[PDB]
Design a protein around this ligand. Structure first.
Ligand SMILES: CC(=O)N[C@@H]1[C@@H](O)[C@H](O)[C@@H](CO)O[C@H]1O
Ligand SMILES: *[C@@H]1O[C@H](CO)[C@@H](O)[C@H](O)[C@H]1NC(C)=O
Ligand SMILES: *[C@@H]1O[C@H](CO)[C@@H](O)[C@H](O)[C@H]1NC(C)=O
Ligand SMILES: *[C@@H]1O[C@H](CO)[C@@H](O)[C@H](O)[C@H]1NC(C)=O
Ligand SMILES: *[C@@H]1O[C@H](CO)[C@@H](O)[C@H](O)[C@H]1NC(C)=O
Ligand SMILES: *[C@@H]1O[C@H](CO)[C@@H](O)[C@H](O)[C@H]1NC(C)=O
Lengths: 49, 476, 49, 467
């Protein structure tokens, strides 16, 4: 749902007629780890990550 | 003596207290509460439209305001009788409601040239020196033309963000919804709440002829320069046609007697200050009389200033198709109440002089008085640390918490923590390093150590006083 | 790994969808780190979001 | 000689206390709660209509009441909780008359009528509407067994325009529709009562229900309700024979106590009202005598309802039974409290307990003398809050409400979200100066007295023991 969230509320906020002058484009710096994770057993979280 | 002289001095105080109590019971009835309660719930606790749940109390955008002004507002002003417009079939909407706008002008501040390619205009925060006065939009009527503060008979308001003037672009509304809706639509089409607007006022009043109590209603909406909406409301139950029933003449007679009593007290105080001991201010029992008489004379002066000033009602009664100007009367009524409520407090407090009729009360009074000379120093030393914590919290958390967003708010938050009401469940989000540290230090040093010296001093003073008074029997 | 997220609404939205369907953020991808800017000329204050 | 008389007195008091405790506890059956809760949930929580949600608890107009009297009321009363009706419900109206002001001469041309707040001198005794029957003709209070009610706004009379409905749904619906078609709830209305009773043969428990709707002179609606269950057979099994035996032995005990007291006061002409353990015994005796009188009064006339299970067609007047039941409960619940408190004279046999007893008996004078100086300041703050916040918070509306709010503040239950916004200045001042003068000063003085007296009395008692 992050993609619909950004496409619905954030992009209309950044652009527009006047819409809150920004002074700078956005960025999406991102990390990967390379150490592929596996889903935990059923349940949101047991203790921590 | 000390008995035949005090008996008169006591009965004169008791009659004063009785008269003051009669006045207090007189002005505050039990019918104002439900009046104001229904009046408030009619406008504040109803959604703007049935398809949403955003009421005037929780506005969040410039667009929601337009939904409110044509919506729950018009629906709560004009009721079809089973022309006049009775709100609850009892309240009478006298006159017409008036809307008003306060806005600033284009280019009110300055921007650096290196980034003056994207920033095309700025609208500075509201200021009397930066308030627009030019006619904007279609120059038809009073809604697009500036009007001075003296041409509207207005005054300042002291809102939440700043203190707004009485000028601005105003508009009077009709008596029937059919034309008021058209006027609001005309305002909304040719954009009237531009980016430059900073405040909006809506004013009206009602009568509710059953009881004799006018009710004046003011609604403020503030637009900060950083974006957002801040609502505020004020409903005031004034009374201007007092003399109808016998109880009103009774209240007038009690007022006259109260004036006579205060004149008596001021005369017997001038006589004592001049024809007796000079500089008798080391008693605290005479520094209380001066406060009481000053507050009373201020209240009487305010009452004479305001009550004698009612010609606006007569002007409204001449022609009843114009907006009534009752704003000043509500302000002065509020000021008068704020003075009477403190005067009665001190009058009640003064009674402590008259309770020494046996050993126990006398010794308790002696303990309480003797324990005040030394508690004063610790009170100062404790309030210094209190204000140190207050300023520290205001500087650190006073930007993201909103409980510490203002110095006095910081003081109130600390007092609430002392009572045990506020939990730090948001402070960690506000700050994780200095949050728990501050909370623990404050709740440990000022609740386990500093707050017990107050107990210790009182406990020791009472013990020594009782021991001395008991030893006062080994000599006799 | 960064993404500029375009300049205007249409191109930025198209690039967002383009990188969404090509599996840019479904793998390990510990964090996302969206952060752009803000500046209010009326008061003269910047804001890091 | 001391031990023998003391143990006799103690054992007699223990028998009295255990008899009273059994008698009171045998009067509480756990189904009364379930009955009242379900009755309230049925008559007060169900929506007025299918498409609306404004239940009787949240009435907001004189028109919603007309929907309630045709919606949830009929469904709950004439159900498919499994109760059955007895007698017939009655609906009564209290109005005031036109012309009850002296209208100001200035604007007398615009307005044309007052409907003043309800009072006995301003009641409308004249007929109105179609002069059909009782529903449009004033009836005196004495003609109809009535009494005052003490509603939320004011105390109402027992007179008014009354009407008795029918037994089944159709005729009651027709009568209500006939009342709605004409103007029965005029602008001059000030009170509306709905009264009836049910039996619920499933479990033996009568229920008398009264609903009140008040129309203040400033518009709006104020609803209130009162449900009183009753059990008026009391002779069904062995348990209530045991209860009757306990009742009779309780009467014998109170007779013995009162005759002992009258003999004692005959011995000591005066100076008998100072020990404070006789001033409490006389209070207990008086309360018990009042309770037994009320019980006799409310059990003398119980047969009158028996000829109502035979499905009569009239209104069962059951207000007195419910009122006296409430009064008898409110007397039992206080005599039990006092008889439990009186027990603080038979536990001085120990050493530590004796010290605590003499401590509390030696620091009572100072505590009472200081509770005056504390309450003077307390009332000063109460009056200040009432004058400042007595119109818009809703927590300082009445005067006693201010006192109760301050007492809750002492327990640390402040809101402060409305105190600061009702008056930005002089409100926070009151709040801050109230906490500094209570939690720091005036609540550290009781402890000082209780801290000094305890040490003094322990020192004296230890010296006497070592003397
Ligand atoms: C007119 C009316 O309903 N008033 C009743 C009356 O019928 C009844 O006889 C009386 C007690 O017997 O209580 C009252
Ligand atoms: C406000 O002023 C700026 C420059 O001061 C100019 O663009 C114009 O007059 C106004 N802006 C707009 C967008 O009309
Ligand atoms: C303003 O005046 C013009 C001409 O006087 C008129 O046509 C118009 O309806 C008026 N109102 C507007 C533009 O809202
Ligand atoms: C302001 O006061 C004057 C004084 O008579 C009055 O004529 C006028 O109607 C009032 N209101 C306005 C908007 O000028
Ligand atoms: C109420 O009394 C006044 C007194 O003159 C009268 O004018 C008015 O018509 C009365 N109200 C009704 C509804 O008739
Ligand atoms: C009132 O009149 C008679 C009795 O007086 C009755 O038959 C009639 O139904 C009642 N109602 C109306 C509207 O006439």
């Amino acid at each position: 749902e992050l993609w619909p969230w950004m496409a619905h509320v954030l992009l209309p906020y950044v652009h527009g007629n006047q819409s809150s002058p920004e002074l700078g484009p956005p960025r999406l710096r991102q990390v990967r780890l390379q150490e592929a994770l596996y889903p935990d057993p059923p349940g949101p979280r047991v203790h921590t990550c | 003596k000390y008995l035949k002289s005090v008996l008169r001095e006591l009965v004169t105080y008791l009659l004063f207290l009785i008269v003051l109590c009669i006045l207090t019971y007189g002005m505050m009835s039990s019918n104002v509460y439900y009046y104001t309660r229904m009046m408030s719930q009619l406008f504040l606790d109803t959604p703007v439209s049935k398809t949403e749940k955003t009421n005037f109390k929780t506005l969040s955008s410039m667009e929601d305001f337009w939904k409110f002004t044509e919506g729950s507002l018009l629906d709560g002003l004009y009721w079809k009788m089973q022309n006049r417009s009775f709100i609850f079939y009892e309240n009478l909407l006298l006159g017409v409601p008036r809307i008003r706008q306060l806005r600033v002008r284009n280019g009110s501040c300055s921007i650096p040239q290196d980034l003056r390619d994207e920033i095309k205009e700025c609208y500075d925060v509201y200021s009397v020196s930066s308030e627009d006065r030019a006619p904007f939009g279609p120059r038809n009527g009073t809604a697009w033309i500036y009007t001075s503060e003296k041409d509207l008979n207005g005054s300042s308001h002291w809102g939440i963000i700043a203190t707004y003037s009485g000028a601005g672009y105003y508009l009077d509304l009709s008596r029937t919804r059919e034309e008021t809706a058209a006027q609001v639509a005309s305002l909304k089409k040719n954009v009237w709440l531009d980016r430059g607007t900073r405040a909006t006022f809506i004013d009206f009043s009602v009568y509710n002829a059953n009881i004799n109590l006018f009710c004046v209603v003011r609604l403020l909406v503030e637009f900060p320069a950083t974006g957002g909406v801040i609502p505020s409301w004020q409903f005031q139950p004034l009374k201007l046609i007092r003399y109808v029933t016998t109880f009103d003449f009774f209240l007038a007679a009690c007022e006259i007697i109260f004036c006579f009593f205060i004149f008596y007290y001021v005369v017997e105080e001038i006589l004592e200050i001049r024809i007796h001991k000079l500089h008798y201010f080391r008693s605290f029992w005479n520094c209380l009389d001066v406060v009481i008489v000053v507050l009373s004379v201020v209240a009487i002066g305010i009452n004479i200033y305001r009550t004698s000033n009612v010609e606006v009602l007569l002007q409204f009664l001449e022609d009843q198709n114009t907006f009534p100007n009752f704003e000043h009367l509500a302000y002065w009524q509020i000021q008068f109440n704020n003075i009477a409520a403190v005067t009665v407090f001190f009058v009640w407090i003064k009674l402590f002089k008259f309770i020494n009729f046996n050993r126990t009360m006398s010794q308790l009074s002696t303990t309480m008085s003797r324990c005040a000379k030394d508690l004063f120093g610790f009170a100062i030393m404790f309030f210094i640390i209190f204000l140190a914590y207050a300023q520290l919290a205001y500087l650190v958390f006073g930007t993201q918490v909103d409980d510490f967003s203002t110095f006095q708010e910081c003081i109130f938050t600390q007092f609430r923590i002392i009572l045990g009401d506020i939990n730090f469940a948001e402070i960690e989000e506000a700050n994780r390093v200095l949050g728990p540290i501050y909370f623990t230090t404050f709740v440990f040093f000022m609740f386990f150590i500093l707050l017990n010296m107050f107990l210790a001093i009182i406990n020791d003073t009472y013990s020594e006083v009782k021991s001395d008074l008991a030893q006062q029997k080994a000599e006799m | 790994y960064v993404q500029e997220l375009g300049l205007s609404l249409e191109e930025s939205r198209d690039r967002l969808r383009f990188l969404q369907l090509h599996n840019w953020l479904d793998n390990r991808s510990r964090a996302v780190f969206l952060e752009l800017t803000r500046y209010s000329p009326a008061v003269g204050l910047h804001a890091a979001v």
